[PDB]
Amino acid sequence: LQLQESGPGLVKPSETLSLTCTISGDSISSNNYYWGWIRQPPGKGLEWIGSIYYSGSTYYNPSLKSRVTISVDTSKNQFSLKLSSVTAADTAVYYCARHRRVLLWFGEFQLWGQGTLVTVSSASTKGPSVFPLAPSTAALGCLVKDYFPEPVTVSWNSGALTSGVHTFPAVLQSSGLYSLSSVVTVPSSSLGTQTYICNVNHKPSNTKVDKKVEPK
Amino acid sequence: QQLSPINIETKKAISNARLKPLDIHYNESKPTTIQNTGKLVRINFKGGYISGGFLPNEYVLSSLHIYWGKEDDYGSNHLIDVYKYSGEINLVHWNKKKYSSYEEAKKHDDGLIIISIFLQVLDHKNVYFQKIVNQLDSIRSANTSAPFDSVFYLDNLLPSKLDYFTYLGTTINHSADAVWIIFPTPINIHSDQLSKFRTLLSYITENYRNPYKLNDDTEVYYS
Amino acid sequence: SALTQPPSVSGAPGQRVTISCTGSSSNIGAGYDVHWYQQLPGTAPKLLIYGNINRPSGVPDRFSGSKSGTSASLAITGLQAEDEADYYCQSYDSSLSGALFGGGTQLTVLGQPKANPTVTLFPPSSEELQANKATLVCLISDFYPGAVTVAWKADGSPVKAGVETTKPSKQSNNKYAASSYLSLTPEQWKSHRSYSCQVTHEGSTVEKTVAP
């Protein structure tokens, strides 16, 4: 069993945030469970948004009851969140999770999705520029420059290269744009022969850049 | 998806802190009509409720269903350690505190609670159960209704001990999901009384539904 | 309708640490169970304890749960370094008619030794220069504690503009990392013999130098 959020990183203020969880490896139509959305503002606590039964019944957080809608699609093994009239307090990581029905109330959240960051901002979508950091053991890398919003993932050789990899936390510039770098330490004898490509994925703009990094 | 009825396995049942004693108020419960449905006997009610125990609100009484088998020793829907009782009564309830009618409550997650009282064929003539047994002459044909022309107090069909198992399953027809409250201690009736149900017409020899597999992820609780 | 947790706890490795979860008559005191979750930085919450006392497969024996009255408690008996995380109690509340999380407890494991920073400095790429821009990238990793000071030099003279430096944050190994970015014009880059990134940590400095 796996849960998998799907939805936009960015939504303009006073508009409707929209997310979708997709379940795989097991059926959503089961009377033993509810399907819940939870959020975490950066550096703050978990807040339960609401939950839904396979057959339609909903239970929402009374703080957010008037702005929240949840729905199920048993034919497509998924359920959705819509959160209306959005301000900077609604900027958060949004998690989908399966929790237990215990008789006439809820039990534990057994399985959670990865989480997806939604940022409330009037500003526009900005996919990064990617520049190779040549090796000159040896350190080589990729400079991922001027994106908005977070997040950005970096892999090397489509995930085959993991040892010695350190993708650093982004700097937030005075412009309001982010930049980060990813480096990999490698044996310096490999530098003539061995291919090194960083794969940058900025999902908020669907910007995907593969950059080969060679000695200059 | 966990369907009803099931074989309750005692070794797999677990505790929970909220399973206090169940308060049952039928002091103001009266029967209305009684029906032969072609499959089984239904008795409708107006008034009465259940509360306490693990329930957050009270659930009001709706109707009573009666099940039986071909022979006296084997006629219940539910089982406890592969053991069947002679028959089974199902008292249906619904969340009137939250929802506006029964058919409305049938669509919600927490709409229904069904209580299960077992019947065991001994050699005692149940004086309270007889008052149901007497009414069966009216509803001989299939799909007939008659008024309950008899004073009846539902409290007197409760078992002597109200220790209970409880699990989430469905209604018997798989119409809706429902929480079950199942009393293991059966009420005692005579073979005469039960055999009268077998003279009803669709001859309705038996109407119990066979059990479904207790899933690995379904929890059954003891009080 | 609130679950209170102390915002932070700390202990040395191998100590016993407890985290309390105070509730009310509408949640813990009504017999609705308490569940606990562990969250590592940047990852999803993971179920740690369920039904007051139960452990799922994979959760080690050192994690333990209890409950009495309106209060519940996560005990960790024998702190390991991997246990640095946020911990959340969770339950059901009858007036809310739904789930309820506590505020969370940040658990810090004390006793880590001092560790000097690893520093890597990259010059501007050919590609960035061809696009009329230039970034020097100083990368700082595997240090403890988190406080770091970063100075830049152009030919041994202090650089006073174009610098932006991240606040240090925890890596997955519980040591700190930070980045410093010096942006220049291509003219400025080619105007000096070398640039340097100097990183000061707990009184001593690590220096790296790059040249056009």
Instruction: Give the 3-state secondary structure of B113-142.
Output: EEEEEEEEECCCCCCCCHHHHHHHHCCCCC
- CB C55, CB C77: distance < 8 Å: no
Could you say which of B1, B16, B221 has the minimum Cβ distance to residue A31? Answer: B1
Could you say which of A95, A110, A216 has the minimum Cβ distance to residue C47? Answer: A110
Last residue of a domain, one of A69, A87, A122: A122
Q: What is the largest CA-CA distance in chain C?
A: 73
- Rg (C-alpha) for chain C, rounded Å, is 24
Task: Give the C-alpha separation, A61 to C63, whole Å.
Answer: 30
Distance from CA of B206 to the nearest CA of A (A): 29
Distance from CA of B112 to the nearest CA of C (A): 17
Q: How many domains does chain A have?
A: 2
What class is the C112-212 domain?
Answer: mainly beta
For residue B193, give the H/E element and its range. helix B191-197
Domain check: are A77 and A31 in the same one? yes
The string of DSSP letters for C125-150 reads: PHHHHHTT-EEEEEEEEEEBSS--EE
Task: Please report residues of A whose CB lies closer than 8 A to that of C88.
Answer: 45-46
**How many Cα atoms occupy the beta-carbon half-sphere of C182 within 13 Å?**
25
Give the burial class of C206: count Cβ atoms within 10 A of its Cβ; 0-12 exposed, 13-18 middle, 19 or more buried. Answer: middle
The one-character DSSP state at B38 is: S
Q: Is C30 on the interface with B (CB under 8 A)?
A: yes
Could you say which of A107, A114, A181 has the minimum Cβ distance to residue C44? Answer: A114
- Cα B5–chain centre separation: 11
CATH number where A202 lies: 2.60.40.10
Q: Is C163 on the interface with A (CB under 8 A)?
A: no
For residue B195, give the H/E element and its range. helix B191-197
Please give the residue of chain C at the shortest CA–CA distance from A100: C50
Contacts by B95-104 with C-beta closer than 8 Å and gap 24+?
B95/B57, B95/B59, B96/B49, B96/B58, B96/B59, B96/B60, B97/B57, B97/B58, B98/B57, B102/B62
Cβ neighbors of A188 (< 8 A, separation 6 or more) are: A135, A137, A138
Contact C101 A173 (CB under 8 A): no
Could you say which of A169, A173, A174 has the minimum Cβ distance to residue C177? Answer: A169
Range of the domain at A194: 123-216
Contact B219 A57 (CB under 8 A): no
> For an interface test with C, which of B14, B18, B99 has the most C Cβ atoms less than 10 Å from its Cβ?
B18
Contact B17 C94 (CB under 8 A): no
Strands A10-11 and A116-120, bridge-based pairing: parallel
**How many Cα atoms occupy the beta-carbon half-sphere of B36 within 13 Å?**
21
Q: Is A216 on the interface with B (CB under 8 A)?
A: no
Domain check: are A168 and A196 in the same one? yes
Domain check: are A60 and A157 in the same one? no
Structural resolution in Å: 2.3
List phi, psi (to 5°) of B11.
-60, -25
Task: Please report residues of C whose CB lies closer than 8 A to that of B56.
Answer: 94
Domain check: are A103 and A203 in the same one? no
Task: Please report residues of C whose CB lies closer than 8 A to that of A49.
Answer: none
Fold for domain C1-111? Immunoglobulin-like (2.60.40)
Q: How many domains does chain B have?
A: 1
Range of the domain at B131: 1-223
CATH number where B81 lies: 3.10.200.10
Distance from CA of C6 to the nearest CA of A (A): 13
| Domain span(s) for CATH 2.60.40.10 in chain C | 1-111, 112-212
Task: Give the C-alpha separation, A64 to A44, whole Å.
Answer: 17
Task: Give the C-alpha separation, A120 to A11, whole Å.
Answer: 5
Task: Give the C-alpha separation, C96 to B181, whole Å.
Answer: 25
Domain check: are A77 and A184 in the same one? no
What subunits touch chain B, counting only 3 or more CB pairs under 8 A? A, C
Q: What is the largest CA-CA distance in chain B?
A: 47
